[PDB]
Design a protein around this ligand. Structure first.
Ligand SMILES: O=P(O)(O)CCCP(=O)(O)O
Ligand SMILES: O=P(O)(O)CCCP(=O)(O)O
Lengths: 264, 264
């Protein structure tokens, strides 16, 4: 049986020559490849990278924050991970279209609730191919008219198994990717749990897969680390609404990672 | 050196058990897999499937039609491939947002011109990661509020090479996929030609990759066919505007396919 992490490791190796130099919005250098995909089983295991310790605390805490539709940067910083932070992911996932006044204004029932709509569609028409949700980059909102939507993450159902595919126009292989894998795999676990489905697969598809220059050395060392069996996520309680989730409902098990690896 | 077609063939083999039964909008049966990707080199070759004769005439003629932003079904049927057809792909690629009155109304400068915007961004900021364009399914437009966008096809530039990645929420492996591969590879050739870039790669990413039941037999026979070298597309003329392209500007060469394969 193959390992899911060998995919990430292998993608890193592929970027490191056969990667091409390319500057980003800031001008910092990176090695980039266009077009990548990887599949992670969510069946009796959670894709929490082992070749390095992933900040699971931040993953969970940040997700609960986005699910709360909160645009209050303080509401996250107080949770132990990091006031008006503009219309971030949360405001889009719950109020897609509604105009953001401030972190104190009220948006109940305002704008399209992408998240709930996915849940509803899962339980009213699981064969649907339009179970898509659609985060944006705040920075682009004012830039032009009708900007494209940094990431989108179509869901799929079959044989009582909920799968998820995340597509990102650009991916930070060194820091972003490992975090996002776990992140969306968690979201999938939540959606699956409230829809009465079993986690199936999580597919991560990228457009511009890039490695930042100053991350090359740490990553080269990380490639020399032998992957360990993925952990197991457990939802030790019964939840019916996505909003009713609490950081205490989930529990990582069997997580034996390699030392943490700092990256700028 | 590997062959691009072995990917399509191999994906077909993977669907045919390890594929799962799943009904579509009509209820017809299909074998489906979630999450797929394939890369096709556009360097000195065009990804026109050889294991069967692809209707290149329709590909080209239909693309020119969409590029013309025409929503007149008659304007396509008269070209030898097939009056008001509602806001189809063309109307979205050139008038994203504008309201469709009829195939006779005027929409000059109305709505966002996704296509031209991609071209412009390529020549003003090739390193950009927001070079995305965004077709919809007309059927979904009235269905709900802010529907998700059947397909999207982010462009990428590096070393004077233009690449393209198409993401479809669902893909008809038997009939749609072969047509779309060529289709978007052609679009990429056009964009690359007017931007003064060389075609790089075309990546086709799918969400729900399905094979229709009544296509299983033909496809099983098609798998037994040995792929032949891809042809070569030639733009035998100099064009500066995407709208200035004519079916006579392109010429397929070295296309030696296997017999045609009808599919319902
Ligand atoms: O191009 P996107 O939407 O992926 C933006 C993040 C770029 P950086 O802040 O310069 O790393
Ligand atoms: O679900 P989408 O947007 O891929 C629609 C085509 C479905 P069919 O007409 O029932 O084959």
């Amino acid at each position: 049986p193959p390992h899911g992490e060998l995919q990430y490791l292998g993608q890193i190796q592929h970027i490191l020559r056969c990667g091409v130099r390319k500057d980003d919005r800031t001008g910092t250098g990176t090695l980039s490849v266009f077009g990548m995909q990887a599949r992670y089983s969510l069946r009796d295991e959670f894709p929490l990278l082992t070749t390095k310790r992933v900040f699971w605390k931040g993953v969970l805490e940040e997700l609960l924050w986005f699910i709360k539709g909160s645009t209050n940067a303080k509401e996250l910083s107080s949770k132990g991970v990091k006031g008006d932070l503009g219309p971030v992911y949360g405001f889009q996932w719950r109020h897609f279209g509604a105009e953001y006044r401030d972190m104190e204004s009220d948006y109940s029932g305002q704008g399209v609730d992408q998240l709930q709509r996915v849940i509803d569609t899962i339980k009213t028409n699981p064969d649907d191919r339009r179970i898509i949700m659609c985060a944006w980059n705040p920075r682009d909102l004012p830039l032009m008219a009708l900007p494209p939507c940094h990431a989108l993450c179509q869901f799929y159902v079959v044989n009582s198994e909920l799968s998820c595919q995340l597509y990102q126009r650009s991916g930070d292989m060194g820091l972003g990717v490992p975090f996002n894998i776990a992140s969306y795999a968690l979201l999938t676990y939540m959606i699956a749990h409230i829809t009465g489905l079993k986690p199936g697969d999580f597919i991560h598809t990228l457009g511009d897969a890039h490695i930042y220059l100053n991350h090359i050395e740490p990553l080269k060392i990380q490639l020399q680390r032998e992957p360990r069996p993925f952990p197991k996520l457990r939802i030790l309680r019964k939840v019916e609404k996505i909003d009713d989730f609490k950081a205490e409902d989930f529990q990582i098990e069997g997580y034996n990672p390699h030392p943490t690896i700092k990256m700028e």
